[PDB]
RNA sequence: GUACUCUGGGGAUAACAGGCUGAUACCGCCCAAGAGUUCAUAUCGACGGCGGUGUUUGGCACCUCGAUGUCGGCUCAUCUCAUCCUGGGGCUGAAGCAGGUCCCAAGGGUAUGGCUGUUCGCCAUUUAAAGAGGUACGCGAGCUGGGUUUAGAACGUCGUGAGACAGUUCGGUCCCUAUCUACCGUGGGCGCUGGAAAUUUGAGAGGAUCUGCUCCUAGUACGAGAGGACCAGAGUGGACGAACCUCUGGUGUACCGGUUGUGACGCCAGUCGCAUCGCCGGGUAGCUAUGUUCGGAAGGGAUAACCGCUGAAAGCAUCUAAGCGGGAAGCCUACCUCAAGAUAAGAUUUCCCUAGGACUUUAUGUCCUCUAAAGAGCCGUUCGAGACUAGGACGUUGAUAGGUUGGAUGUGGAAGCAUAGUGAUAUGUGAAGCUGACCAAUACUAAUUGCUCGUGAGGCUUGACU
RNA sequence: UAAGUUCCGACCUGCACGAAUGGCAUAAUGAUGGCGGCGCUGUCUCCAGCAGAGGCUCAGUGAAAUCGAAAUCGCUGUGAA
RNA sequence: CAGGUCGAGUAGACCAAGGCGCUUGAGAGAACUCUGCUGAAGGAACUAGGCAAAAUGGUACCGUAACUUCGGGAGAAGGUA
RNA sequence: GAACCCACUGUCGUUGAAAAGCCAGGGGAUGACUUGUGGAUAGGGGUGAAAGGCUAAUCAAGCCUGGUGAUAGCUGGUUCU
RNA sequence: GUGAGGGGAGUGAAAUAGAUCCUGAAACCGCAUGCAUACAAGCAGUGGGAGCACCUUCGUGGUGUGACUGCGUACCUUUUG
């Protein structure tokens, strides 16, 4: 809320309402809208969160992930409408916000350790 | 043509149910109050002269303050003209008001603002010119003018040679903005992409010259 | 965000392994080229008994950068590595099989057959 | 570089017509009654009725 | 351009500042009183209030980061047991600046900072 | 012999650039044998003739030898048109698509690399195109110094030798704080027919001016076939420019954390100083591009080559002599910005000042007393404004700045205590603690009491209205 | 090498190599000359942000080379050109 | 002459005994210049030339080619803790 | 590889802090090594692992004083009506 | 400021003979009065010439200034120039 309340109104209007709750590290899926001429369908995108960014509706969260042996990170912006849905598929425990790092480390060295209750 | 008079309040976006982000600029609208109409036969021209916001009386002089009791308004922190003909002169009356509802949703708009101060600014800033080698010898000369001329022909420097000077803080209008949103409850416009000058400046509104 | 002198691996089987760009196509004083775009390329390593050699000139289209793609709502797509697929003199694939994923701004005419090898396209 | 020419006093004194001094905004205390500088604390320790030195 | 920054230079080092606004703000919790330039004085505002709001309330912890940004233990026992029961009931402006003329060095503007309920 | 060198002189006398000239150079025109299946002139054009320009090679020796101190590259340009692309046309040995040739047109645009000191040149790959020239072969008190042309050394060659070169090779100090003119920005003064606060007209000035590809018309017109349009519409790019920070990133030495060495705070614990911010990982505002948005759209007027209508001189013919049209990225407008020092100093709205004496230089007269307006400034709190200025906001009838309170964000589990461990550590209290610049409230602190400037109805003549 | 007036190997009409003004080689050595590669990077595409020191303003002290005299504009022409 | 903690050390970081803060300051936080830190994608495309900068860097063990005057090359290269 | 002795590269400095330096890198560092004190060699002479190098910020013939007011077919200047 | 410096007083024929003190020029630098000067382009003068101020024998006069206007590119040397 470092905004002018106008702008805060005209944002908060557009707010997503559903919306779970996930930390750095925890491994998820979204399910992605593609829209080619009149089809539409759901594209499932899993992999882990290394970065958050709580902005409001200017929230964001990067997902990466190694697809057919190439790493490919995507920056999801939270409350559009191409993201359909959010599951989290298991909880990360790690000791930074930003999980940068992983991205110079491959196989068992990238592992997560689970978040145990 | 006949216009608004708002303040740039910052951007954000708008998002589309198809998920595309746009990036819009928030103008905050005063309701702009008719202070003056200037006609062919006194002033030798069509114009409409408006004000808006408010200001204090220890602030308003004496001959503002009788120019605006004359239209019978609430002293405003500026005063500005539209010129006009007379299909829009029409309908507009000493004493009146102008909101937000003069646009539509779609409709293109010119957006003229005041651009930020950049101050005393070098050839590189201002002009894009191109800086020489880092290494490989070069003497104190990175980001110099380099030559301004010729030789003793024609043995002077050209009128509008570009070289370092006061940048930023001027008159700026940006054309081709859609308008995303127009809301009458706040007052607001919402009109898509970057528009001149700082949060909180004085922005002009106006109809596209362009078709 | 390819230039002239940078390097890619290959998207495909052709044969060539790595590429160097030495131009990119499509206009007066163009700097960079980005996935969907043409570069012509010279081969600097590619396996024996292959189709293409060490040393030849060929045309390309970008599939993968480092720089990434950005997408209406916002997002951007990054990659861990800038790859390229090989095409002919009148600028069609050459290869049968597609290695790794590609995006959707390869869906045209002229390389559908990139999309329908490709094992994801995101 | 370095002029051609010797500059006249003339010149000289059109140069230097901007050196002019211009004096400070003084006023009369009215706790105390001696001029002071404006919104400045007087040489005795008084401003607008506080005293800072006993 | 310097658009919407805060904090000054006072031409010296990151360190020697903090280090020199630390002593200002050690002598003016102990003397209650004191003369310097006044760019200084204005600057010693931000640093020497939110000592006393944080002295408002007596606790191990509060103490301890008082004396990590003091590093006098006479400054964080007069601040714990003077100044903030003092202060309790004051929202903000515990300083006043005064401008007190020019100094004969090098004709440098002063300014006198002051408790404000001294004495 | 002197390149190890020195003195007195010369622009009386050479090398650079300038000047005169134009043999040479480049460009243009006249005649026309012939070539072109016939057919000089679609395109070429022998033998000969006449000019233009002032980019070449030269001639002369007028300026400079009490110094005009540069081959190329870099940075930054400005002009010409004998036009490279884009625009408009005539002819064709122009079916179409293309091409050839000539005329008009200077608005904009007009490659990156390999080799070499190169200019040039050859080569690779692009582009709509990679034009020709002038500007001290533009630019070194703006940069470089690879080549050439000091002093060292060597090779080939010449000389008995000192040494030398239609040569080669390795190495080899680039000074100047800008007075005047000019230019880019930014102020002070006065003027503008009493003074003041605003809003303005536009005589004029500057900026901008580029273009690819795909689809469609339509596989239509054209053509045997191969191929394949004009005109007229959509979509999407390159380069360039501006504004902006919502998005994506960079930075972020006053924000958070991890960690090494050492010293200290009496000790443990907890902290701080120093080591490039010690190092390392993140990161708020601001600034910013590689990020975002937008622009060169459309239309009027006069024209260039060119094409005409009607029409005589000259019973015909003829775009022309009367008269009437069409016609280009070019000109004037149109778009953006500036603009009344436009001394021709413009216009509109509103506001302010309505006192007495003496005297003679009898007048917008000179001296006394009274009066001090509308406003402007000094000063202070300051700014997304700024070198200083100027400009914007506010000064208690107050949110201008700091602080305070709340929120937001970033970092990521404070200290203390308690549990489990022999211990390093882990967990709970608790997503805690701390959080520059952000948002919102709030007179707690500072914008005090003030002073200065600016006057007192604005000359005369004539005309029209009263 | 995509592209090599440089580099390496070979050829020999050696303008004008050649045997102690030594010839041809040669391990090691060289702040020696030429060419190529890996890594690396603000050298560059193309620059951005930040830190310190100047620059700028105020107070004090206080130079320099130069200088016939200056009321010291543009263009075209003229003219020790 | 020359102490302490690490250290091979009289190297180096921080300290002891013992000395100093270098005889103009105060503000501001523009262009441009000097010295530094970081930098998206690319990685010599720069340039006469990788000039400058970036980079490598310790101890123990393993392992190490052509060539050679048998000494070297060699800390070759490269790897593990 | 420090001290010590050198001077290969670059930026800065060039009316400098300095009439040859600073900073970052660089070479030698038990030897043909570096260095203190005191001596010897004197100008067509000395000395030189040789650059015409050095011989008191001076070297293809040191400095000082005399011949000397050298000579100059050259340049400049030459005073009231 | 028990400073420097000055104003009175006093001495002296004279102190503007007051101590770096006879006379006291010029370059150069101040203050005061009069006139001119902020729409106009250049060796700065010269030949004309309105107005203003002071004086005055009251003018067909004297002193200072100089709106506006015709003409007008320093001096020396060396040179065909
Ligand atoms: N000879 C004439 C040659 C015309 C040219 N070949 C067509 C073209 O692209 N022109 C303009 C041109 O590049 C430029 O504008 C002007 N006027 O210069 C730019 C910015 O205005 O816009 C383009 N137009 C565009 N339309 C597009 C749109 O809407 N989306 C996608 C993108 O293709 C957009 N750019
Ligand atoms: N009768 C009249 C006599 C007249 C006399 N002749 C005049 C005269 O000679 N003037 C010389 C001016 C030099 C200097 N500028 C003076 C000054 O003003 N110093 C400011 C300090 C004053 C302060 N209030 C006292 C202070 O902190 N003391 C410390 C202390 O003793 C001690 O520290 C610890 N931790 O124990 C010591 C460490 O060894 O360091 C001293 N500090 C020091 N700072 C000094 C420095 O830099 N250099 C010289 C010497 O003075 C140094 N010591
Ligand atoms: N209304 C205003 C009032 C204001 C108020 N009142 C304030 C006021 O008034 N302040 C006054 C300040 C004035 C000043 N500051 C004071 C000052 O200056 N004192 C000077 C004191 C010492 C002075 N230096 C000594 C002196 O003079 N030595 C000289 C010197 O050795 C030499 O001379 C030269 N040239 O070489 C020699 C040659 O002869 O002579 C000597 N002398 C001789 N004298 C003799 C003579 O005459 N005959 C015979 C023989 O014995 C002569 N020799």
Redo the contacts with the bound molecule.
């Keep these: 809320?470092?905004?002018?309340?106008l702008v805060?109104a005209i944002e908060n209007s557009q707010l997503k309402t559903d919306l779970p709750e996930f930390?750095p590290g925890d491994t998820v899926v979204v399910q992605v809208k593609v829209k080619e001429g009149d089809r539409e369908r759901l594209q499932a995108f899993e992999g882990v969160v290394i970065?958050?960014?709580?902005?409001?509706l200017?929230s964001?969260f990067?997902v990466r992930k190694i697809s057919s042996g190439v790493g490919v990170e995507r920056?999801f912006?939270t409350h559009s409408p191409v993201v359909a849905k959010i599951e989290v598929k298991r909880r990360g425990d790690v000791?930074?916000?930003?999980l940068?790092?992983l991205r110079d480390l491959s196989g068992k060295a990238a592992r997560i350790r689970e978040k145990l209750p | 043509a006949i216009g608004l008079v708002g303040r740039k309040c910052?951007?954000?976006?708008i998002f589309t149910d198809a998920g595309v982000?746009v990036?819009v600029?928030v103008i905050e609208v005063d309701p702009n109050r008719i202070t003056?109409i200037?006609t062919l036969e006194?002033?030798?021209?069509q114009?409409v002269?408006v004000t808006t916001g408010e200001?204090?009386?220890?602030?308003v002089?004496?001959?503002?303050?009788?120019?605006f009791?004359?239209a019978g308004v609430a002293a405003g922190?500026?005063?500005?003209?539209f010129?006009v003909t007379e299909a829009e002169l029409e309908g507009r009356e000493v004493g009146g008001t102008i909101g937000v509802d003069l646009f539509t949703v779609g409709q293109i708009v010119?957006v003229?603002?005041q651009?930020?101060?950049?101050?005393?600014?070098?050839?590189?800033?201002?002009?894009?010119?191109?800086?020489?080698?880092?290494?490989?010898?070069?003497?104190?000369?990175?980001?110099?003018?380099?030559?301004?001329?010729?030789?003793?022909?024609?043995?002077?420097?050209?009128?509008?040679?570009?070289?370092?000077?006061?940048?930023?803080?001027?008159?700026?209008?940006?054309?081709?903005?859609?308008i995303v949103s127009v809301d009458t409850e706040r007052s607001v416009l919402v009109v898509?992409?970057?528009?001149?000058?700082?949060?909180?400046?004085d922005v002009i509104v106006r109809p596209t010259?362009?078709? | 965000?390819?230039?002239?002198?940078?390097?890619?691996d290959v998207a495909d089987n052709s044969g060539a392994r790595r590429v160097?760009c030495?131009?990119?196509?499509?206009?007066?004083?163009?700097?960079?080229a980005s996935v969907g775009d043409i570069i012509?390329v010279?081969?600097?390593e590619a396996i024996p008994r292959a189709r293409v050699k060490?040393?030849?000139?060929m045309?390309a289209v970008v599939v993968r950068?480092?720089?990434?793609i950005?997408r209406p709502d916002?997002?951007?797509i990054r990659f861990d590595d800038?790859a390229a697929v090989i095409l002919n003199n009148n600028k069609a694939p050459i290869a049968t099989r597609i290695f790794g994923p590609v995006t959707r701004e390869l869906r045209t005419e002229q390389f559908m057959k990139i999309i329908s090898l490709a094992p994801e396209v995101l | 570089?370095?002029?051609?020419?010797?500059?006249?006093?003339?010149?000289?004194?059109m140069?230097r017509?901007?050196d002019a001094?211009?004096?400070?905004?003084?006023?009369?205390?009215?706790?105390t009654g001696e001029t002071?500088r404006?919104?400045?604390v007087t040489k005795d320790g008084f401003?607008?009725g506080?005293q800072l030195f006993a | 351009?310097?658009?919407?920054?805060?904090?000054?230079?006072?031409?010296?080092?990151?360190?020697?500042?903090?280090?020199m606004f630390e002593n200002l703000a050690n002598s003016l919790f102990e003397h209650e009183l004191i003369k310097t330039?006044?760019?200084?004085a204005?600057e010693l505002?931000?640093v020497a209030?939110?000592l006393?709001?944080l002295a408002?309330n007596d606790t191990?912890?509060?103490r301890?980061?008082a004396?990590?940004?003091t590093?006098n233990?006479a400054t964080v026992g007069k601040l714990f047991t003077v100044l903030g029961p003092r202060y309790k009931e004051?929202?903000?402006?515990?300083?006043?600046?005064?401008?007190a003329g020019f100094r004969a060095?090098?004709?440098?503007?002063m300014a006198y900072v002051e408790l404000?309920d001294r004495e």
């Design positions: 809320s470092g905004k002018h309340p805060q930390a970065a958050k960014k709580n902005r409001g200017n964001a990067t920056v912006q000791r930074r916000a930003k940068y790092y | 910052g951007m954000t976006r982000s990036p600029t003056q200037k006194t002033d030798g021209y114009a002269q200001r204090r009386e220890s602030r002089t004496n001959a503002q303050k009788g120019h009791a004359k922190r500026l005063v500005k003209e010129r010119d003229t603002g651009s930020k101060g950049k101050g005393f600014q070098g050839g590189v800033k201002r002009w894009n010119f191109r800086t020489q080698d880092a290494t490989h010898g070069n003497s104190v000369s990175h980001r110099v003018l380099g030559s301004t001329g010729q030789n003793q022909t024609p043995g002077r420097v050209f009128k509008g040679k570009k070289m370092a000077g006061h940048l930023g803080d001027e008159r700026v209008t940006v054309q081709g903005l859609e898509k992409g970057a528009i001149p000058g700082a949060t909180g400046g010259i362009k078709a | 965000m390819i230039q002239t002198e940078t390097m890619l160097q030495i131009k990119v196509l499509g206009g007066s004083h163009r700097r960079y012509k010279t081969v600097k060490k040393g030849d000139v045309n950068t480092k720089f990434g950005r916002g997002s951007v800038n | 570089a370095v002029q051609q020419n010797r500059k006249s006093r003339s010149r000289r004194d140069r017509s901007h001094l211009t004096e400070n905004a003084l006023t009369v205390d009215q706790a002071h404006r919104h400045h401003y607008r506080r | 351009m310097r658009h919407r920054n805060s904090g000054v230079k006072l031409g010296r080092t990151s360190s020697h500042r903090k280090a330039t006044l760019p200084k204005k505002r931000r209030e939110p006393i709001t408002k191990v912890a509060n301890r980061l004396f990590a940004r590093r233990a004051r929202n903000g402006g515990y300083l006043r600046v005064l401008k060095g090098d004709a440098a503007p404000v």
